[PDB]
Amino acid sequence: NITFYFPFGHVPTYGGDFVNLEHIRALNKHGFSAKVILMKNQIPIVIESFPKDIPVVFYKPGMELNAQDVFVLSEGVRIMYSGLAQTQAFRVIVHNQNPFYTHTGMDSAHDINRYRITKIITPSHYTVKKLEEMGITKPMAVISPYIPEYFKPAEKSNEEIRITYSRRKREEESKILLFYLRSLYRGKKALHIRNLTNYKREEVAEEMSKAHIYASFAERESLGLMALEAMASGCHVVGFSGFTDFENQDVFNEENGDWVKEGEYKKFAEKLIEAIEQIENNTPSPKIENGLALVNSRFRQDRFEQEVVRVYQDILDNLPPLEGFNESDKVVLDFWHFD
Amino acid sequence: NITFYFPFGHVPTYGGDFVNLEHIRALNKHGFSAKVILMKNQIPIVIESFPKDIPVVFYKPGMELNAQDVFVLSEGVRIMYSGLAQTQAFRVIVHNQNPFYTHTGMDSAHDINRYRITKIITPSHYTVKKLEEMGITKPMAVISPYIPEYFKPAEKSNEEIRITYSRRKREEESKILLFYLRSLYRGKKALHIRNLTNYKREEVAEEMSKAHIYASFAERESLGLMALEAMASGCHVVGFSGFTDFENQDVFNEENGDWVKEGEYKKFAEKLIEAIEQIENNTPSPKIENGLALVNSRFRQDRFEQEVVRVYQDILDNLPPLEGFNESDKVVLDFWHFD
């Protein structure tokens, strides 16, 4: 009789927030008990932002949960760690979806290593290695997010070349690259380039579905979701991989994208021009087919649901003993006083 | 009877603005004629911000200059290029101090190559190669800025270790690095780390003068002035070089800094710890001496003044013929209508 509680303090916003809702949904679908605990900002705009099928409990100082319950913490929100250090009750899992933001939740690896974390769930084997590089020695698990089914190819134009890119990361580097592209491209046809930085996620899917090429400005990725979305959409991916230490991941390779290294703006533009000429000649890259096959095999919902069940059941099968409590004991939560 | 006109539209702000004032000062000191032309914002706060020894002329639609005069344009401020394309009078030099911002002034290399630019002055041989990589074929020259004399070593503490760094660039990467440093450093002593991002330039000099180590977050540099300031101050420089294509510059090398590559946060922290232990043991790096010698020999005011005279005289000795004007003819400037 264990519930997994996922703390939120705001409307779901970041990629990471939406993944956590998918964790909750998969858990509840497959016989587990999972809920949002909304720690603060208990106002209608926030409350109403959680879909109907997501259970929400409100934090109130003095409420009681069960000693056996599990908190699934972000790598951020330091205050969740300091509060829960006030009791011996509960288990703690960290869902670290952003290894380079580990500094937003905990002071150092030492503090993580001394905390009663039972497991760290990560998006990728790369993330595991990055946290271990940082000095973290806690047990780790991988559950990669999935690409929603509405990312898929649509018919692409046979008379104009459509390129899309995001400036969410590397805003200034996209301007540099596009300057090289304008400087080096000598083909006849005008290029159709669209910045999708501020599109809604379904609009991103729509734009990619019709795009021939996705110019990648990925940066310090865990998995590389934008690129995988592009691959799901049948786009040729050209540009930054998101991994300076590219050798520490095995999702992206020479056969599913034209990757460049930091600062390689000329090579980036040259690869774009090569990709443009392939589309102009109606001989699109075989890297598109490889990218499609990658997403189909590894990054859709069925496999995610399998991995959620596997990983969370393994955690439930391997919990530390409760110190100072029995299962079913009620425990007051009064560790936070928010505005 | 040639005057060099340096356009400004605001109080001197950026590094580049202050370098241009030093160009003006050197030119006027050594027998040339150079002035600011203040294009707009002719209000006391702006007017008063120019030092007394900097000549300032105000743009007014309908004013006259001499056909032979030379405009020294920034790589930015597109409107200066479009305006001056309305006449055959004048010569144009570009002082491109920021090659990665070339996109802020001109659409492409093609547009630069077709413009009547007589010479592009740059901060470094690296910058020359970068612009040429981009497809620019105009003649180029190098005048490196100098480090002001108030950057120099002061006595440094023998009992605490002082590190300084800037977040002007790579704001988020400094947090990542400091997280690795906190995670990996196991020495006794508490570190004295100061962020100087918002210090005045003289305060930067003061802080560096007392600092043992400068942690470098340089990014897409032309020359690497912050690092050179640190070297002038007797700091050990550790971290990012500012040059992804490090092989295309020859200022920084293994003997004057502990440079790391992109994403190498662990190696960065490890080099910092090595530098900390050297200071703790009173055996500071010989790279400090090499850095001092570099600045003394190449980056002080006397050499800058030599290079200004050399480069600008070479330009005056090699001007294109005036088309459609004689020397001494008056030419109306009415190409801009600013707020």
Chain A contacts in chain B segment 52-111 (CB below 8 A): 100, 102-103, 107-110
Fold of A3-145+301-333: Rossmann fold (3.40.50)
How many C-beta neighbours within 10 Å does residue B267 have? 16
Inter-helix orientation angle B201-210/B225-232, to 10°: 50
CA nearest B212: which of B239, B242, B198, B191?
A: B191
Distance of CA A89 to the CA centre of its chain: 29
Residue whose C-alpha is closest to residue B73's, from B47, B30, B104, B27: B104
Smallest CA-to-CA distance from B322 within B139, B82, B92 is with B92
Domain layout of chain B by residue ranges: 3-146+300-333, 162-298
Cβ neighbours around A158 below 10 Å, total: 7
Resolution reached, in Å?
Answer: 1.9
* Distance (Å, whole) CA B245 – CA B223: 13
Q: How many CA atoms lie within 13 A of A8 on its CB side?
A: 29
Phi, psi (deg, nearest 5) at residue B290: -65, -40
Give Cβ neighbours of residue A314 (< 8 Å, ≥ 6 apart). Answer: A141
CA gap A130, B168 in Å, rounded: 26
* Residues A93, A72 contacting (CB under 8 angstroms): yes
CB under 8 Å to A231, separation ≥6 — which residues? A237, A256, A257, A288, A291, A292, A294, A295
Report the alpha-carbon distance of residue A311 to residue B301 in Å, rounded.
64
CA distance A179 to chain B (A): 6
Task: In whole angstroms, give the CA distance from residue B129 to residue A321.
Answer: 64
Sign of CA dihedral A130, A131, A134, A137: negative
Pick from A207, A245, A269, A35: nearest CA to A130: A245
Cβ-contact B59, B39 below 8 angstroms? yes
Residue reference for tokens 């020695």: A137
Query: Which single residue is written with the structure tokens 């009663």?
Result: A116
CB contact burial A206-230 (16+ within 10 A = b; e otherwise)? bbbbbbbbbbbbbbbbbbbbbbbbb
B267 to chain A, closest Cα gap in Å = 10
Q: Which CATH number is correct for A162-298, 3.40.50.2000, 3.40.30.10, 3.90.1150.10, 3.30.70.120? A: 3.40.50.2000
Contact B89, B115 (CB under 8 A): no
| Residues B21, A184: Cα–Cα separation, whole Å | 34
CB-neighbour burial class of residue A302 (10 A; exposed 0-12, middle 13-18, buried 19+): exposed
For B105, counting Cβ atoms within 10 Å of its Cβ (0-12 exposed, 13-18 middle, 19+ buried), the class is buried
Contact flag A182-B107 (C-beta cutoff 8 Å)? yes
Q: Which residues contact B149 (CB under 8 A, 6 or more apart)?
A: B300, B301
B46/B11 Cα distance (integer angstroms): 5
Whose tokens are 């290294």? That residue is A261
Query: A315, A119 in Cβ contact below 8 A?
Result: yes
SS3 content of chain A, % helix, strand, coil (to 5): 35, 20, 45
Solved with: X-ray
| Residue of chain A with shortest Cα separation from B220 | A263
Give CA–CA dist B79/B298, Å, rounded: 35
CB hemisphere CA count around A142 (13 angstroms): 16
> How are beta strands B3-8 and B33-38 bridged, if at all?
parallel
- Name the nearest CA neighbour of B209 among B134, B152, B263, B250: B152
If you write DSSP's letter for every residue of B85-109 in order, what string do you get?
TT-S-SEEEEE-S-GGGGGGT-S-H
The dihedral of CA A77, A80, A85, A86: what is its sign? Answer: positive
Smallest Cβ–Cβ distance between A100 and the set B100, B107, B176 belongs to: B176
Name the residue type at position A268: F
Give the residue among B155, B157, B154, B105 at the shortest CA–CA distance from B131: B105
Name, in order, each residue with C-beta under 8 angstroms of B306's C-beta and a sequence gap of 6 or more.
none
CA–CA distance from B291 to each of B133, B150, B254, B295 (Å)?
A: 29, 16, 11, 6
Q: A24: how many CB neighbours lie within 10 A of its CB? A: 26
Nearest in space to B98 (alpha carbons), one of A323, A172, A217, A267: A172
- What is residue A102's three-state secondary structure? helix
- C-alpha span between A66 and A1 (Å, rounded): 9
- Rounded CA-CA distance A180/A175 in Å is 9
Handedness of CA B220, B226, B231, B232 (dihedral sign): positive
Cα separation of the two ends of chain A: 32
**Radius of gyration of chain B measured on its C-alpha atoms:** 22
Q: What tokens does A245 get?
A: 């230490």
Integer angstrom CA distances of residue B313 from B21, B58, B72, B131, B143? 18, 26, 14, 23, 13
The minimum CA-CA distance between A283 and chain B, rounded to whole Å, is 28
Bridge-partner residues for B239, per DSSP? B216, B259
Q: Check: CB of residue A8 under 8 Å from CB of residue A72.
A: no
Give the chain A residue whose CA is nearest to the CA of B184: A135
Q: How far is A174 from chain B (nearest CA, A)?
A: 11
Taking the C-alpha atoms of residue B66 and residue A46, their distance in angstroms, rounded to an integer, is 66
Asked whether the domain spanning B162-298 has the same topology as the one spanning B3-146+300-333, the reply is yes
Q: Which of B24, B90, B75 is nearest to B333 (CA)?
A: B90
3-state per-residue secondary structure call for B130-176: HHHHCCCCCCEEECCCCCCCCCCCCCCCCCCCEEEECCCCCHHHHHH
Q: Which residue in A113, A42, A100, A39 sits closest to A71, CA to CA?
A: A39
Compute the distance between CA of residue B151 and CA of residue B163 in angstroms, rounded to an integer: 16
Question: B3-146+300-333 belongs to which homologous superfamily?
Answer: Glycogen Phosphorylase B; (3.40.50.2000)
Q: Are B261 and A244 an interchain contact pair (Cβ–Cβ within 8 Å)? A: yes
| Interface contact A131, partner B, CB < 8 A | no
Place of tokens 């290593």: A113
Residue B53: how many CB atoms within 10 A of its CB?
10
DSSP secondary structure of A167-183: -SS-HHHHHHHHHHHHH
Give the count of beta carbons closer than 10 Å to the beta carbon of residue B250: 10
> Residue B244, Cβ neighbours under 10 Å: how many?
17
Count CB-CB contacts under 10 A for residue B328.
9
Give the Cβ contact number of residue B3 at 10 Å: 18
